Amino acid sequence: SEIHVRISDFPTIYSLRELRESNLSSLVRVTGVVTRRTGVFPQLKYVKFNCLKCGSILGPFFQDSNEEIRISFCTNCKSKGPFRVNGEKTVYRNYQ
Amino acid sequence: VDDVTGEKVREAFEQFLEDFSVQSTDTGEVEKVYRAQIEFMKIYDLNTIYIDYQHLSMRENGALAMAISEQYYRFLPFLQKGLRRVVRKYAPERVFQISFFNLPTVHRIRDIRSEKIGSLLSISGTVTRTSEVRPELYKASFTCDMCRAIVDNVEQSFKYTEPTFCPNPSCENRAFWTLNVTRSRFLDWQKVRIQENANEIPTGSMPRTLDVILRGDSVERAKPGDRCKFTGVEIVVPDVTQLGLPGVKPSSTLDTRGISKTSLGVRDLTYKISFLACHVISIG
Amino acid sequence: VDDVTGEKVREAFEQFLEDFSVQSTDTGEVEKVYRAQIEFMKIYDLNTIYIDYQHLSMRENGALAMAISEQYYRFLPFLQKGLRRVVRKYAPERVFQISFFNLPTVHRIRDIRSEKIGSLLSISGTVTRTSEVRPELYKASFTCDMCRAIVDNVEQSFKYTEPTFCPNPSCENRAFWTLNVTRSRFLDWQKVRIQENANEIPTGSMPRTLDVILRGDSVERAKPGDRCKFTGVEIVVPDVTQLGLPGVKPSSTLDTRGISKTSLGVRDLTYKISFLACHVISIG
C-alpha cells in the first residue's frame, strides 16, 4: 500500500560549502565520500494505542515525518486515558 | 428505494400543486387557485399556506392520500423541499408551514391508541390552563474554539446539544460546542393543555387530560374556555416519573460483541403520548 | 533631543552621500562615484556597499567623523534607514550591510581596554581554527495559538525568545510563542578565532586568543594560517564560567519599593569581550 518514488538527474551539482541560507526546503544534489555510520534501527509508522481505563485498542494513525506525537483523548468521553503504545500490531520502518 | 419512494411522492406532490386545482366553471371560484395563494402571499409576505385535504382526496384515486396520512413525520423535509423549489420557480429567509385541514373523521381522546403513531387525526376537546410564549432554537451555530466556530447545523430535532461529526476543525470527535446566542433563527411556541369534552365521557369515570404543542402560526389563537379542532401529527415525549409502575420496562445496554479487548453507559427509556398541532380553528 | 541627535546625523548622512564624492578632474576617477556603486549594484543584484572612511574624514571638518566613530552600535538603524530611503529614491527583500574600511591607526590585542566599548578599531592578527557555516534567525514570526500567530517581530538582538507586549490577540502578557520554522529570513555566520601576531608580544609571555564573529558578506573569506585586518564594532558576550574568580561581582535584585503588599528572581551577570567584524581583507 505504498510506493515512494525516485528522482534521477537533477542538473546542478553543488560540491559542498555552497550551501547557504536560501537553499533550505529545496532539492539539492551533492557529491562526497562516505565516512562512518550507525546500525539499523526501527522507527514507528502506524501507531495503535490502547487505553488502560476503557478496555480496548483505539485505532491506527499516520505520524509522522517527523513529529511522533501525541494523540490525547477519545472514545471514552475524552478521559482519563493515560495511553501506552503496545509493541504489537504497529508497523515499523527502518532508519539509519 | 425508500429515497425513491419519498422522492417519488415528492415529485408527485410538485406535479399535484403545479396543475389545476379548481374544477368549477366561470361561475366561481375560478382557476387556479393555488397560484393565487402563492402570489397573494407574495403581496403581504406572511409565509404560510393553508391547503385542503379534500382536493388531494379527489385526484389520485386515494393512492397518494394513503401515503402522506400514515407516515407524515417521515415526510416533512421532502414535502417542504419540493414546495421550496416551486417557490423558487414562481417567486423571489423562508420558513414554510404546511397545515392541512378538513379531515373526514374526528376522534376523541379515548380512541387514542399507540398503533396510530405518526399519522394524522382530528382531535376535539376543551382548552384549559394555557401557558405563555417562549422561543426555541432549532438552528444551531455551534463548533469548537480550536479553531472554526461557524458551522450551521442540527438540533432541529430535540436533543439539544451538540454537533457530533466532521469536527472541529481541527478538534475531532467528539469536540463540540460552545454554542452561540446571537447567530440562530428562532420561533416561538406555547403549550396549551386540552381537557376532554363534557358530553362524551363513558359513564361513569372522570375527565382525562392531554398535552398539545403549538408552533409558528397557531400561537395565541387558543382561548381559555372554548372548544377547538386540531391537527394530527402526534409525537412521543420522553418521560421520567413512571418508574416502579410495575414494568417490565426495556433498557438499552449497548453491544460489545464487536470491539476486541486487550463503561456501563446503559440507559432507561419510558415514553408518554403528547400531541403536536399547527392549525387551530375555534368552531364550537 | 537624542532622537533629534540621531535623526540629525541621519539627515547629514543622507546629505553626505547624495552629494559629490569625487574631487578629481577629467583625468580620473570621474564623478560621482557613489551613484555608480548603487547602479553597478543594481545591474548585478548583490546587496552590499563598500564605503570609505577617508572621504567622510574630508568633508565635515571632523565633526560627523567624531559622531559615528564613538557610538556606532547606537547608530545602525538610523543609518540603514536613511540609506534605504536613498535607495527607494533612485532604485526599485533588501538587507543592507554598511562596511567601513581604511581607518587611520591599527591597534593590537594588548591595546584593548573597556573604555573603548562601542567604537571602531582596526585589529590585525592571525587566523587559527576556523569553524563552519550555520544559520541564525533575527526575523521572528511568533505569536500565541489563541488566536493570531502572524506577528513579525523582534529578536534582532540576541535573546532569542520571545515577543512580550501587545499579546496575543487575545491572550495578553506574557503569552507568546510557539515560533515558526518556515516564516523567517535567515543569514549565515561563522566564528573564527584570531591569535596574536608573533612579532609583537611583550617579552616575555605567551600568545593570547580572541574570538570574532563574521556575518553576511565576509563568510568564508578568512584563511587558516594567514593575516587579516578586521572591522571594529566590539560587542559584549554573556559569560558563565567566571565564578569564584574572586569578585566582588554585581547582581541585579529588582526593586520592590513600588508595589504595595497585602519571588527571588534575582540574577547574575559576568561578561567577556568578544569582537564583531564585517569586512575582511587578507593583506599580509
Curated annotation (Swiss-Prot), chain A:
Domain of life: Eukaryota
Location relative to the cell: Nucleus
C4-type ZnF: 51-77
Function: Acts as a component of the MCM2-7 complex (MCM complex) which is the putative replicative helicase essential for 'once per cell cycle' DNA replication initiation and elongation in eukaryotic cells. The active ATPase sites in the MCM2-7 ring are formed through the interaction surfaces of two neighboring subunits such that a critical structure of a conserved arginine finger motif is provided in trans relative to the ATP-binding site of the Walker A box of the adjacent subunit.
Anything else known: Present with 1690 molecules/cell in log phase SD medium.
Record's subunit section: Component of the MCM2-7 complex. The complex forms a toroidal hexameric ring with the proposed subunit order MCM2-MCM6-MCM4-MCM7-MCM3-MCM5; loaded onto DNA, forms a head-head double hexamer.
Family: Belongs to the MCM family.
Protein's UniProt name: DNA replication licensing factor MCM2
Gene assigned in the entry: MCM2
UniProtKB/Swiss-Prot annotation, chains B, C:
Quaternary organization: Component of the MCM2-7 complex. The complex forms a toroidal hexameric ring with the proposed subunit order MCM2-MCM6-MCM4-MCM7-MCM3-MCM5; loaded onto DNA, forms a head-head double hexamer. Interacts with MCM10.
Modification Phosphoserine occurs at: 205
One biological process term in Gene Ontology: double-strand break repair via break-induced replication
Keywords: ATP-binding, Cell cycle, DNA replication, DNA-binding, Helicase, Hydrolase, Nucleotide-binding, Nucleus, Phosphoprotein
UniProt subcellular location: Nucleus
Spans through the membrane: none
Record gene name: MCM6
Name of the protein in question: DNA replication licensing factor MCM6
Cellular compartments per GO CC: CMG complex; cytoplasm; DNA replication preinitiation complex; MCM complex; MCM core complex; nuclear pre-replicative complex; nuclear replication fork; nucleoplasm
Role according to the record: Acts as a component of the MCM2-7 complex (MCM complex) which is the putative replicative helicase essential for 'once per cell cycle' DNA replication initiation and elongation in eukaryotic cells. The active ATPase sites in the MCM2-7 ring are formed through the interaction surfaces of two neighboring subunits such that a critical structure of a conserved arginine finger motif is provided in trans relative to the ATP-binding site of the Walker A box of the adjacent subunit. The six ATPase active sites, however, are likely to contribute differentially to the complex helicase activity.
Family membership noted in the UniProt record: Belongs to the MCM family.
Whole-protein coverage range: 103 to 463 of 1017
Single Gene Ontology MF annotation: single-stranded DNA helicase activity
Note: Present with 13400 molecules/cell in log phase SD medium. Early fractionation of eukaryotic MCM proteins yielded a variety of dimeric, trimeric and tetrameric complexes with unclear biological significance. Specifically a MCM467 subcomplex is shown to have in vitro helicase activity which is inhibited by the MCM2 subunit. The MCM2-7 hexamer is the proposed physiological active complex.
Higher taxonomy: Eukaryota, Fungi, Dikarya, Ascomycota, Saccharomycotina
